[PDB]
RNA sequence: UUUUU
């Protein structure tokens, strides 16, 4: 059980301030700053701004939970400036790689001593302010990586990303593995359990952790709902927050008794001076379809078209002559001429950021984007328009939550430019108004820890001499939240008594049986000895952290990757970085299906042993997870082919192919110094040759923000 | 609790600055032309 | 029918 307490220090009519103190520790109030400001600002800070600045000035960890449009970045800038002044190093980590590039750009523009460090790019890695991705930091922490020796602050941006069942575990790994002598700045969206995160930090690395929570937004919002069939918008909620039940009832009665649609609403919006506009849709086909439907309207001025020509010309001049004739460039240029553009994960990554620059400039007045244009990406609009409310998540087909609604709708309203933000919602099919009231009234969500066990975790922690997997299991946020319901498991004294007894008394082995099973598999295969100490076979697997390392190391040791060419080896490795499904299964030649069948046999042999050791794996999804849908594309690309020649052999978007190739280049990089572990020299340089004949014309291109 | 990085370094290769790159200045070139933008 | 190192 954890011994922490909260003090709830008073705040003067602004935000809410609380501090998590470790058990028997007296709350000493924050002393005032003695000296000069570490960073002056052109404006007047708000209450929560000043409180977070004061928390940073006293060398104490602080968490701020507010909106994106509130000014939550100022605190991190102050912390970076003060650590620069005191001759200390800083780390600024971001989940997404593009967000890292934009952050590096905007922080090089201001501090002038910064450095970028991602998997793809590394710029000036000797600085007191390093911008890195979360996985690079975790790799550094697992290795020696004597760069955190002289660091005093670590800044986590978008802390709510620790809610993913797939990639939220490396986040907790990074937080747990950090030293006890560093101070943190966590930035959050509005969450209910802000206090519980500070309690976890206090229990984790013996120090106070403050909490700043506010719901202030500089520009008020006004929400509307547009029923399917009608003319006019029904103001459901306004800048004061009351639900105005009469207009919700009127709209729903219209949709009930009565039950180009987007074109009319966009024309209405653009007639009453509501530019710019963001249209949010959850299918990439719908965005392009709506852009084509709006093609018959013009918004830009004659000079604006010259400006868009001038800004597009250089961005495509960097792209060489052959790629300037690609279909997508000539498809998108007229749309950007008219004043409209699309933004989805199927575009070329250079056109995406060109359109981002154009929208930031102000020459794009109606954007048609997917969900991941609002999460991160630093540009707001005046109006936000939702076309649908249902979305495919990955496992089912589901309604948008209140958290997603708040995230996307908060992009409306620009500080000082407009008086209020306008949000429009479309309802089309039997809204059944139990939902729709929940979306516009509810809180966003609590954040919960997933923290599943991985083989890389166990392999790395068995290599370190003074840390074990049990420690990381015990110190996880999952365990911390599962020790919190003592008041309510013991309080069942008033049948249900048997149940409540069972429930509380039972749990002692939470994710311990799984760990035992994983260890058993590891020592059965040969990665670790019976005495549970790592081997030569398991030190190779520690160098692979992109794909399934067990099966890859099984290939490395069995002798599957030798007697193969470089092209047909890098085509075989494409099965480990591509995870999307396609309509059709291409046909492979014998020299491209033999290695696939040997891959599948090794996968079956792995799965048999993994499932005879009480692990719950079905040997259909394991073999169906490795998808050879791009193996001939990769093989053709590493022969001298053209990008235009090759994005006609499959019905997969170009952006997906580019992403797969970048991931495969990263995996090849790790396979180079995973083969250079067992003294393999004939095989080490084959991966390097495969790396050389990938990155040639357009898949790997200089970033516009870099 | 957390041990020193010296013991972390043993048993694995160090961390290298793979794919080092430098600012080409294209972003500054584009920004140089952005003189009469609606936002500015 | 989105997503991401
Ligand atoms: N208290 C304040 N008063 C006036 N302007 C502010 C205040 N706080 C922040 N700002 C400005 O408003 C901007 C808000 O935009 P924001 O989304 O935070 O940009 P960013 O991506 O976080 N950097 C900040 O970048 C400041 O330029």
Author numbering:
A (entry chain B): 96 to 354, 372 to 606, 831 to 1042
B (entry chain A): 659 to 698
Reported in the publication:
The nuclear exosome targeting (NEXT) complex plays a central role in directing non-functional transcripts to exosome-mediated degradation, but the structural and molecular mechanisms remain enigmatic. Here, we elucidated the architecture of the human NEXT complex, showing that it exists as a dimer of MTR4-ZCCHC8-RBM7 heterotrimers. Dimerization preconfigures the major MTR4-binding region of ZCCHC8 and arranges the two MTR4 helicases opposite to each other, with each protomer able to function on many types of RNAs. In terms of architecture, we found that the biological unit of NEXT consists of two copies of each MTR4 and RBM7, assembling symmetrically around a highly intertwined ZCCHC8 homodimer, with an arrangement conducive for targeting different RNA substrates.
The 7 Å resolution cryo-EM map of the NEXTL sample also revealed additional density features near and/or within the expected RNA-binding site of the DExH-box domain. To better resolve this portion of the complex, we focused the cryo-EM processing solely on the MTR4 DExH-box domain, allowing us to obtain a reconstruction with a local resolution of 3.4 Å. The resulting cryo-EM reconstruction, inspected at low map threshold, showed density at the bottom of the DExH-box domain consistent with the presence of the ZCCHC8 C-terminal domain (CTD, residues 659–700) as observed in the corresponding crystal structure. Briefly, the ZCCHC8 CTD binds along the bottom of the DExH-box domain, starting from RecA1 and ending at RecA2, in the proximity of AMPPNP. However, additional density was present inside the helicase channel of MTR4. The MTR4 helicase channel is known to bind RNA in a defined polarity, with the 5′ and 3′ ends near the top and bottom surfaces, respectively, of the DExH-box domain (Gerlach et al., 2018; Weick et al., 2018; Weir et al., 2010). Starting from the top surface of the DExH-box domain, the cryo-EM map showed well defined density for the first four nucleotides and less resolved density for the fifth one. The structural analysis suggested that the ZCCHC8 CTD encloses the RNA by gating the exit of the RNA channel—similar to a gatekeeping feature we recently identified in the cytoplasmic cofactor of the exosome (Kögel et al., 2022). Importantly, the addition of separately purified ZCCHC8 CTD in trans to both NEXTS and NEXTSmono recapitulated the compact footprint of NEXTL, supporting the notion that the ZCCHC8 CTD restricts benzonase access to RNA substrates by gating one side of the RNA-binding path. In the inactive state of the complex, the 3′ end of an RNA substrate is enclosed in the MTR4 helicase channel by a ZCCHC8 C-terminal gatekeeping domain.
